[model samples]
Target: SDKIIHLTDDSFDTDVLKADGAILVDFWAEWCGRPCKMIAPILDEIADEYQGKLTVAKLNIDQNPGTAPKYGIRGIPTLLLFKNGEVAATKVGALSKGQLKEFLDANLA
Candidate 1:
C-alpha cells in the first residue's frame, strides 16, 4: 500500500537513512493550525502516484523531536527530500498538489 508511514526518532535513521530510493519526509505535528490537514490528500495521492519512484513518509515533530530539530525544522509543514541517504531538497510551508508535483519532478529525475 502507498499509505503514509509514521516515523519516529528511533526509526528515522533506519527507515529514512537506509532508504533505497528518493524519500520525502514530511515534518509535521498534529496540533498545527495550518498545513497539517492540507498536505494529507496531496501526500496520499503522491504516495500512490510515485510509489516505486519515491518513499513518502511523515514524522510527527512531537514524537520525533530529535530528528526534527536535527534537520533544523522550525515550521509545521516542512518537506525534506532525501536521496541516497542525503538531503537533496527542502521546501518549507504548505504546498499545493501542483506545486508538490513540480517539486518532485524537478528533483527526483
Candidate 2:
C-alpha cells in the first residue's frame, strides 16, 4: 500500500474532492473478498506511471461506509476516477492492465 493512500471518512474530501489533480479512488472492503487485494498492484503501478498527473488511493467500505453509500456503490472494487473534483469515470470489479489503462486514458487528461 506504499503507493496507495488509505482514505477514511475524515479525509476523503481533502485528499480527493479538493485535490488539485485528477484522482482514481478504489472503494473496497475487507469483507468484500479478495478482489480489492488483487487490484492493488495494478493501481500502484498505474499511480506511479501517472504520478504527476493522477493520484490513486483506496477507501475501506466496511470501515468507512459514509462515502460508499453516498456514491451508490453496490460492489467491491468500485473505482471512481475524479477530475477537478468531479467524477469522470466509474468502474466495477477488477480490470486488467490494458483495461485500466484504457479506462484512464479515455477518462483522464
Candidate 3:
C-alpha cells in the first residue's frame, strides 16, 4: 500500500539511507515464494501500525540487482534496518509479526 515505499536502486539511498526515521528494507524478489510474499503482509501491518515511527521499504532483487550486492544481500527476504544512513540491524528468512515488532521496538526505542 501507500505505507510501503516500493524502492528502486535510485531511491534506496535517498529514501532508506538518508531518511529521517528508521526504515526497514526488505530485499525480495517477485519470484521468491513463502519468505518473500508471505512475510509482506506482516510488514504492511507494521508500516500501518508504526505509522510515523518507522517506514517500511521493499526492493526487488530481480528488478534491482545493483543495490543488493552492495548491501551484501546473500539471500532472499533479507530485512535490513537503516538509521542515520547506516545499517543498524539485519535479519534473514521469514519474519513473524512478533519478530518484526521486536525489531521495530528495539530500533525505535
Candidate 4:
C-alpha cells in the first residue's frame, strides 16, 4: 500500500533525511531472497500499525546505490530509524513484528 514510501537516491533526502519526527528506512535489495522477502509484510504491518507515530520507507539498495553505503550499511534489510534528520538507531536483519516494535520503542524513547 501507499502507506510505505518507496525511496530512491533522488527521494531519499526528502523522504528520510529531511523528514520530521521519526522515520524508519529499510535498506533492501531485490536479489535478497529470504531476508528481504520475509520482512516485506512485516514492514507493511509496521507501516499501518505505527502510521502516525512513525513513517516507514523502503530503499532498494540495488537501485539506489548511493544511500546504503553512505549510512555504512553492510547488510541487507538494515532498518535505520531517523529522528529529526539524524540517525537515531539501526537494526540489522528480518526481525519479527514484536522485535521491530521493541526496536522502535527503545529508539523513540
What C-alpha lDDT does candidate 3 achieve relative to the native structure?
0.87
Off by over 4 Å in 3: none
The segments of candidate 2 whose C-alpha lies over 4 angstroms from its true place after superposition are none
Models 1 onward score TM values of 0.94, 0.94, 0.94, 0.95
- For 7-63, candidate 1 gives per-residue lDDT tens digits of 988898899898788889998887986677888888999999997898889988886
Error of 2 at 80 (Å): 0.3
Clashes of each: 0, 0, 0, 0
Model 1 deviation from the true structure expressed as Cα RMSD, one decimal place: 1.3
Better of 2 and 4 by TM-score: 4
Task: Please give, for residues 1-109, the per-residue lDDT of candidate 2 as tens digits.
Answer: 5778789999999999999979899998777666777888888789889988888888988889899888888898999998878988899998798899999998765
RMSD of each: 1.3, 1.1, 1.0, 0.9
Residue 76 in candidate 1, Cα distance off native in Å: 1.1
Residue 21 in model 1: shift from native, Å?
Answer: 0.9
Instruction: Specify the highest-lDDT model's number.
Output: 4
Clashes of 1: 0
Relative to the true structure, how large is the alpha-carbon lDDT of every model? 0.87, 0.87, 0.87, 0.88
- Writing each residue's lDDT as its tens digit, candidate 4 over 1-109 gives 5799999999988888788799999898888889889988888898998878999988888888889878899998899999988999899988899988899988888
**Pairs of residues at least 3 apart in sequence or in different chains that clash in candidate 1:** none
